[PDB]
Amino acid sequence: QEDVLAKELEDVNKWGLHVFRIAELSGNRPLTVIMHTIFQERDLLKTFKIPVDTLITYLMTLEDHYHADVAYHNNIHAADVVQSTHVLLSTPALEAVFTDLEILAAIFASAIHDVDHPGVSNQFLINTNSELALMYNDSSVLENHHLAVGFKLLQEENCDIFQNLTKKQRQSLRKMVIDIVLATDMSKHMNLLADLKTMVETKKVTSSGVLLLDNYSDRIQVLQNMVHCADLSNPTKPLQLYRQWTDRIMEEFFRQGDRERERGMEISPMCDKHNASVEKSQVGFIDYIVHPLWETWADLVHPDAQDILDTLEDNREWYQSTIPQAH
Amino acid sequence: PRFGVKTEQEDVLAKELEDVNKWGLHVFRIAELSGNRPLTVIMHTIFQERDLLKTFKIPVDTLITYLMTLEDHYHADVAYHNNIHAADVVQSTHVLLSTPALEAVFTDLEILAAIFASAIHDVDHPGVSNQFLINTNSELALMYNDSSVLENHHLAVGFKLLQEENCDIFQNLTKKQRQSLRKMVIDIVLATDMSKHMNLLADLKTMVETKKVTSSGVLLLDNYSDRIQVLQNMVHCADLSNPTKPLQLYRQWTDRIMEEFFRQGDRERERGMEISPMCDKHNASVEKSQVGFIDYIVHPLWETWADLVHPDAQDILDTLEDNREWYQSTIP
Ligand SMILES: COc1ccc(/C(C)=N/OCC(=O)N2C[C@H](C)O[C@@H](C)C2)cc1OC1CCCC1
Ligand SMILES: COc1ccc(/C(C)=N\OCC(=O)N2C[C@H](C)O[C@@H](C)C2)cc1OC1CCCC1
Ligand SMILES: [Mg+2]
Ligand SMILES: [Mg+2]
Ligand SMILES: [Mg+2]
Ligand SMILES: [Mg+2]
Ligand SMILES: [Mg+2]
Ligand SMILES: [Mg+2]
Ligand SMILES: [Mg+2]
Ligand SMILES: [Mg+2]
Ligand SMILES: [Zn+2]
Ligand SMILES: [Zn+2]
């Protein structure tokens, strides 16, 4: 029913959009539907002379290159990161900070950032001597590959959505998108966080409270962290959505662990279906990765992200409540 | 065969290979005397010299098969970035590793990594720059996201050739030796990207400022970071060693890099592109450009290396200064 779909797409500017319902209602086309809605919402097709049929053709072939049998790293995850980035771009602390081209880069980066993901980690690909790790010299193996596939698809018939950008704009967009997707590699998380903390310490704001970002380095660092936050946003969502993401990532991990077991390898942490606690694993994920990042983003845009941080803290307290603890 | 390939006389080739431990080995003669197999000949000689086949249980037929295949993937129609340049960088790294200030500093696996990295470090080079590949939307630049495009490719090819029939020279390394060597080779070849030269040199100057030495001048390296940084700079110096060589060698290397640069500029001109600096055969100042190259890149690098291994490199530096004066004296 196209009636219900348009009703759910009314929430596209809100944290917590019911992306799984959109996936079902759209015929498993959440990335196409949500990207189109956002491009309409931000008037991107007219600012960048994007033919609507070119946009739809690219989005459908991009969505086609996310794998349906990969439980977490599929087109629903892409659509979720896109929509979350779309919300974060509109945070009041960043009002009129970014150019339309920077906004287009951040949303495009989000849409392609996990394309053709195989469902196994960079470390797995390195340790199994995979062809992808051979091509990429063991360095941000997946993220380099996502970028290459995402740009390569712009070459399919009637898929060049950037055809009416100037050369300067195309060159700037490509650079920003590369910079953003490479920052989604989790091995870069601690260095990204260390620098974001220092940027918070020295941040400049207009009197109206809007952040001041003078040069490319400061601008791209904010977009990098903002898409990294959107990628790591599942525990900040309403519990009904967060539970579904947790099911999917645990399915994907356990599939990788089963391949490791078959192969005689050490099963990676959290990948052993027989000896894992989901509750501990999420509480550790929030405590050591997700909350340190979001409390720093929240500092940067204070108080814009307080409701997001409140949900994250409530979900942490919820997941820890059934783990026995010394009181 | 005596030297790894068949040659129309091993006696002339042997007297030339007696210089494999000397700066200024006549690498172009070796290429001729070996039937254009200088990389195979010189690598075989070094592996025997250093006893690396026995240390790592490398069958000699596997070594020769890999070197043949690797050599075949350097392009014969590229004037500079060909199998002779690879052979030169290997042999120069081999001399630098023997410098007195580095006596017993590196393990056999670190030596193997430096020499292997030198051999593969430009394989399948197409004769155009990273920036040309980016500017022309090449598939390689698409694959590698405009970052160290060629150097990522040379690594990928050099490692992939290990998988061909009877080519796996590392088959008898342990799995963690393989892992360590792989990481060091990647770290070394990525450092040959010239866009990293200024950062690499700045860090080398910092290492020189706080260098630790025994009483006899031998460097004291403390950890992987120290060791890999010295190997990275060593192979970068070997890559940038042409102007420090005997002048007749340097003159040929200059002729070859200009031929390659000019053919890239012709491709740029044909496509209406701005011609890259030093690639316009119609507006070139070859001699002035060599003096600039030495003043701004090569001398600052080699004076810092010479500081690290003082006084081991003093003659290399003196030759650099004399060669600078040759090109200065021939500016029209
Ligand atoms: C909903 O929860 C999660 C959502 C997303 C993620 C991602 C993308 N995490 O990135 C880490 C990573 O890629 N690994 C890759 C390899 C499998 O080895 C592992 C040790 C880590 C992680 C979530 O939860 C965690 C903690 C318990 C379940 C997973
Ligand atoms: C014997 O002389 C040379 C030997 C080697 C080189 C190499 C491999 N690289 O140099 C940097 C580079 O890769 N570039 C590539 C692109 C064309 O754009 C430029 C930024 C330079 C350069 C030599 O001399 C050159 C530099 C001065 C006169 C010609
Ligand atoms: Mg990813
Ligand atoms: Mg459940
Ligand atoms: Mg905390
Ligand atoms: Mg020994
Ligand atoms: Mg090179
Ligand atoms: Mg064996
Ligand atoms: Mg030290
Ligand atoms: Mg003129
Ligand atoms: Zn992701
Ligand atoms: Zn080279």
Q: Is the CB of A56 under 6 A from ligand 1?
A: no
- Contact between B140 and B133 under an 8 Å Cβ cutoff? The reply is yes
For residue B109, which ligand has an atom nearest its CA? 6
Q: Where are the alpha helices (DSSP H) in B107-246?
A: 108-120, 130-135, 139-143, 149-160, 175-190, 197-209, 224-239
DSSP state of B243: G
Tell me how far the alpha carbon of residue B111 lies from the centroid of ligand 6, in angstroms. 10
Task: Give the whole-angstrom CA distance, residue B226 versus residue B211.
Answer: 10
B186 contacts on A by Cβ (under 8 Å): 137-139
Resolution of the structure in the document, Å: 1.7
| Interface size between A and B, measured as CB pairs under 8 A | 31
Q: What is the 3-state secondary structure (H, E, C) of chain A?
A: CHHHHHHHHHHCCCCCCCHHHHHHHCCCCHHHHHHHHHHHHCCHHHHCCCCHHHHHHHHHHHHHCCCCCCCCCCHHHHHHHHHHHHHHHCCHHHCCCCCHHHHHHHHHHHHHCCCCCCCCCHHHHHHCCCHHHHHHCCCCHHHHHHHHHHHHHHHCCCCCCCCCCCHHHHHHHHHHHHHHHHCCCHHHHHHHHHHHHHHHHCCCECCCCCECCCCHHHHHHHHHHHHHHHHCCHHHCCHHHHHHHHHHHHHHHHHHHHHHHHCCCCCCCCCCCCCCCHHHHHHHHHHHHHHHHHHHHHHHCCCCCHHHHHHHHHHHHHHHCCCCCCC
Of B142, B146, B156, the CB nearest to A152: B142
Give residue B121 CA to ligand 12 midpoint distance, Å.
6
* Residue A31 near residue A59, CB atoms below 8 Å: yes
- Using CA atoms of A10, A15, A20, A24 in order, give the dihedral in degrees to the nearest 10: 10
Q: Which residues contact A3 (CB under 8 A, 6 or more apart)?
A: none
Q: Any idea which residues of B carry the catalytic annotation?
A: 81
Phi/psi-derived region of residue A130, left when phi > 0, alpha when psi is between -120 and 50, beta in every other case: beta
Cα distance between residue B244 and residue B237, in whole Å? 10
| Distance, CA of A65 to CA of A83 (rounded, Å) | 19
d(CA A105, CA A178): 9
Q: Which amino acid is at B200?
A: L
Contact call for A138 and B190, based on CB within 8 A: no
Distance CA B39, CA B217 (A): 32
Instruction: Report the chain B residue with the minimal C-alpha distance to residue A129.
Output: B179
Nearest to B159 among A134, A148, A175 (CB): A134
Q: What are the residues whose beta carbons fall under 8 Å from the beta carbon of A253, sequence distance 6 or more?
A: A268, A270, A271
Q: Enumerate the domain spans of chain B.
A: 1-332
Q: Which two tokens stand for residue B279?
A: 């690639």
Q: Can you say how many angstroms the Cα of residue A48 is from the centroid of all Cα atoms in its chain?
A: 23
Residues with Cβ within 8 Å of residue A170, at least 6 apart in sequence: A162
E strands, chain B, where?
A: none
In angstroms, rounded to a whole number, what is the distance separating the alpha carbons of residues B9 and B3? 11
Tokens 């690598």 correspond to B43
d(C-alpha B173, C-alpha A172), whole Å: 45
**How buried is B180 (Cβ within 10 angstroms: 0-12 exposed, 13-18 middle, 19+ buried)?**
middle
- On whether any CB of chain A is under 8 Å from the CB of B144, the answer is yes
Q: How far apart are CA B171 and CA B175, in angstroms?
A: 9
